[PDB]
Nucleic acid binder design. Structure first.
Ligand SMILES: Nc1nc2c(ncn2[C@@H]2O[C@H](COP(=O)(O)OP(=O)(O)NP(=O)(O)O)[C@@H](O)[C@H]2O)c(=O)[nH]1
Ligand SMILES: Nc1nc2c(ncn2[C@@H]2O[C@H](COP(=O)(O)OP(=O)(O)NP(=O)(O)O)[C@@H](O)[C@H]2O)c(=O)[nH]1
Ligand SMILES: Nc1nc2c(ncn2[C@@H]2O[C@H](COP(=O)(O)OP(=O)(O)NP(=O)(O)O)[C@@H](O)[C@H]2O)c(=O)[nH]1
Ligand SMILES: Nc1nc2c(ncn2[C@@H]2O[C@H](COP(=O)(O)OP(=O)(O)NP(=O)(O)O)[C@@H](O)[C@H]2O)c(=O)[nH]1
Ligand SMILES: [Mg+2]
Ligand SMILES: [Mg+2]
Ligand SMILES: [Mg+2]
Ligand SMILES: [Mg+2]
Ligand SMILES: [Mg+2]
Ligand SMILES: [Mg+2]
Ligand SMILES: [Mg+2]
Ligand SMILES: [Mg+2]
Ligand SMILES: [Mg+2]
Ligand SMILES: [Mg+2]
Lengths: 219, 239, 219, 239
RNA sequence: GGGAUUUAGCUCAGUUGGGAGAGCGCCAGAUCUGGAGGUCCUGUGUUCGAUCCACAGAAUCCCCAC
RNA sequence: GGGAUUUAGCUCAGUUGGGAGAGCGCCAGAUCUGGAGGUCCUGUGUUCGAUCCACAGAAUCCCCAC
């Protein structure tokens, strides 16, 4: 039946980025006392989960970059000899366990994981793009929370065709000041190393002094 | 993007196998009984059941032993994508086990996909069952050696070179009878959907109609898969 | 560098169908004295190539079904322990070599190969569909040869929106009787086994007595 | 469809390695010289050159020895699809070799993709070069043993257990000096694009302009890749 | 298989070789003068020189088909 | 992330539970009477019973974005 394990020896090459994304977290975390659209306790649990992975997994990622509900790990030293299945599964499992511990959950959750096969000159770009994501879902989800506070379809159809700037305007004219909101909501959090430090006020990756920041983070 | 493994798909029927990472030593360090702890096996079976119950996936049944679980699938989510299924299932299992055991430090399952033909599905489990037995003899053997002062590597080598009969002998001389030990240690546990006949009232027909209800059952005294009564057992599990 | 061979141990499960398709054969076979749109010598070389594979490769396919420029082999006994790269490459290479021999080529040709991971109840269907292909390219390519005997774009734009039946009609009204054309052009050729036989007058797979034909071919 | 491997892609830089299937025995049976035939090596180099010249693919360079060829790629057709590249290249190489050798019975190349980092590309070839040497000592050794009546398996075992120095000794006592044998047997052949300076007339400028032209060259006396003059050689090949 | 299309962020022009333009949108000062912005889809050839020519491909569209 | 759509070969209707319809196209005899054709996108639940209800997904479309 080892011959039937047809993906077990499929591999990747360094460097690789593993992105783990919470699976169906909108319905699995509801029921708890989480604030919307951002909960400090939850983001804290995510950063602590990434830190837990860096400290206890033994797989040695260079660093983690998280913004709920996702975490990206950078690897130059591939775990399990670069085997895709084993890396994805084991890492996702570790994160599920760790997050479950930090939140003291009564019912199980699950992460998904995937390998992004970057070339080392593309590593900054990746994170930049990821940070870009962190911005959109920061704006939009606040707007969607400003509205609906409206039904699903209604609050949705107000936001259609509207660009980020008029979302800013609408949000302020509803009493929400995005520009002053915490940096971890807008940009995310970086966990790295030696002692393990969580950085909750990181710069924009594609800028000064954001470029050398990421560059030192990569070595 | 560069997610070059994201479109990798498998075609059911398929068995997913999850195996605890560095479990022997972690369980050893947390104070569990050696080499077998029934609380742990209970946690494994319950984790399998919780997966069958609340994962959103539909495994036909689970077969668990030691630190591993095998799920049978004839239908998969995420269009059968390998990364998705492996990561999500392994994660759910890690989380669930962490809950069942009230762990304070994180554990992890490895997970893999085993692509099978229909006519191949019994064979698989048979092989797995052998492994259970293979583990059952090893785990105890090792234990009995380590008790009397033999080092780890020497004990492992010993078990590797010694044949099963000799290990039975050595085990028996030291007060351990492998034939009297519980069945779940030697064969593992089957978690499945046992069907039962019910009946209710059809108001349109104005009559009583019979129907089926399935209950998630844990079988801790399973037969040998390749035995006489083992074959139709497994065949009914596969259906 | 074995760790960098990231596809070398990727596998398939039985049964599998390998389809090999001539790569860029329209431009690689032109220059020789091949008739259009069908050359008996070439189809003969293809069938002989498949037979050569069945006889000399040692990989034991159950049977081959060919219609230029493609060959499908059925395998229940996977070569090279089901390794995808090795099967595709080795088989395609063997076919390239064999075809090059049978045609006595001065310049190299190449096949592509791919694995179709069928389940054994889907094996008839596959070939049926393949035979369906053999029909379209039989009709169309004759039409395209009836025309242009017109420029590329012109002869093309005559055929647009026209269905198979009016292509039949047009072809006859140009002096081409499709219904009477050789069975190997319409349906293809089956090579199997014991002595190795080429069947140049096979039935339609999805019919009687086409169903039991294929069924005995599969055992 | 069920073509579940068809979308499998690789990301350049990448090296493709092709290796003749059952070549030792086929070459043996066709009457080629043992354990080295220069006509054969010529056919291999010429096949590599013909691949560089007319395959439609753009390998930076080829490195061939024994029955294997490695091509360096920084750009691939079919969007890097594995099945496509492996099958098409292996097929082209089989056909080309069949032509160069005027074979009457078919041969076949196996082919595989080796995914590499830029900074990794030298290392690869170095390892391959080692293998060349490893083959060079084996092929001869085997030969000399088989000459004097030692069976196949016994000879293989002999070569496996005996260290390289001992094999050198045994070889030398029987009249074979591995140091005087040709360089292409020990290091292989490099087929590449050697650049040369040309110059022509710009009619618009009304002046003479210099330019570059690349010629496919076969190097049969290559340096040791990890030697002093070997490093910039390989580095210029990779560029 | 067969026919096409691919050039600025968007919609398009432009020829068969000396390396590129309009309108919308964009920044700097609802209309004018100021701007930025390009891999002419990729690689390799040919050529003194390629957006244009030759070869092998890529992406998207249409026909045949089911 | 957010909003949708998915039912005959094609274009669509139909409700919140007793298991399904029109028009085009199709076969049998340019218009009428004769027909065939269904996995109500998948799996699992709930229910005596699911196209409809609950959960996890799939495919396609739109918004945000770059
Ligand atoms: N103490 C204890 N050990 C158990 C129990 N059930 C299984 N084990 C141990 O779990 C181990 C499983 O072996 P295996 O998975 O191959 O190794 P592992 O220790 O998990 N490490 P890894 O799988 O990462 O290589 C066996 O050695 C067995 O002794 C239990 O109830 N108690
Ligand atoms: N007679 C002869 N043999 C050669 C020549 N060049 C290489 N060989 C043989 O080619 C063989 C290549 O080894 P290898 O590829 O591992 O084995 P193989 O025989 O091709 N079989 P396979 O690769 O299918 O397992 C060597 O054993 C070597 O002796 C040559 O010019 N003449
Ligand atoms: N009539 C027709 N032939 C087609 C169509 N698509 C592909 N073919 C032809 O069918 C044969 C086999 O197709 P196949 O190789 O599976 O697909 P392909 O389009 O060549 N793509 P690829 O080879 O890259 O996977 C080839 O001759 C191919 O050109 C189509 O829509 N219509
Ligand atoms: N704003 C926005 N978010 C998107 C879009 N597509 C995906 N996302 C979100 O971005 C995050 C990461 O996306 P990713 O997981 O890579 O893709 P996905 O769409 O979830 N697909 P899959 O997980 O199946 O690969 C998720 O929260 C996902 O929902 C989009 O078009 N716009
Ligand atoms: Mg996702
Ligand atoms: Mg999520
Ligand atoms: Mg997310
Ligand atoms: Mg184990
Ligand atoms: Mg384990
Ligand atoms: Mg093709
Ligand atoms: Mg072809
Ligand atoms: Mg074809
Ligand atoms: Mg070799
Ligand atoms: Mg070989």
């Amino acid at each position: 039946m080892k011959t039937r394990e047809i993906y077990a020896e499929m591999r990747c090459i360094p460097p690789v980025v593993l992105r783990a994304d919470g699976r169906n977290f909108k319905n699995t975390l509801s029921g708890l006392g989480f604030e919307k659209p951002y909960d400090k306790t939850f983001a804290r649990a995510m950063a602590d989960t990434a830190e837990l992975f860096i400290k206890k997994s033994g797989l040695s990622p260079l660093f983690a970059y998280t913004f709920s509900d996702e975490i990206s790990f950078l690897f130059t030293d591939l775990p399990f000899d670069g085997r895709v299945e084993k890396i994805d599964s084991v890492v996702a499992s570790f994160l599920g366990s760790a997050l479950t511990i930090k939140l003291r959950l009564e019912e199980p959750i699950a992460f998904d994981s995937r390998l992004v096969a970057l070339q080392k000159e593309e590593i900054p770009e990746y994170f930049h793009r990821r940070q870009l994501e962190a911005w959109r879902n920061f704006v939009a989800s606040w707007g969607y929370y400003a509205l609906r506070n409206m039904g699903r379809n209604e609050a949705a159809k107000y936001l259609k065709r509207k660009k980020e700037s008029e979302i800013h305007e609408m949000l302020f004219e509803r009493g929400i000041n995005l520009a002053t909101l915490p940096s971890w909501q807008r940009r995310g959090v970086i966990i790295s190393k030696r002692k393990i430090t969580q950085n909750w006020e990181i710069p924009k990756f594609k800028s000064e002094k954001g470029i050398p920041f990421l560059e030192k983070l990569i070595n």
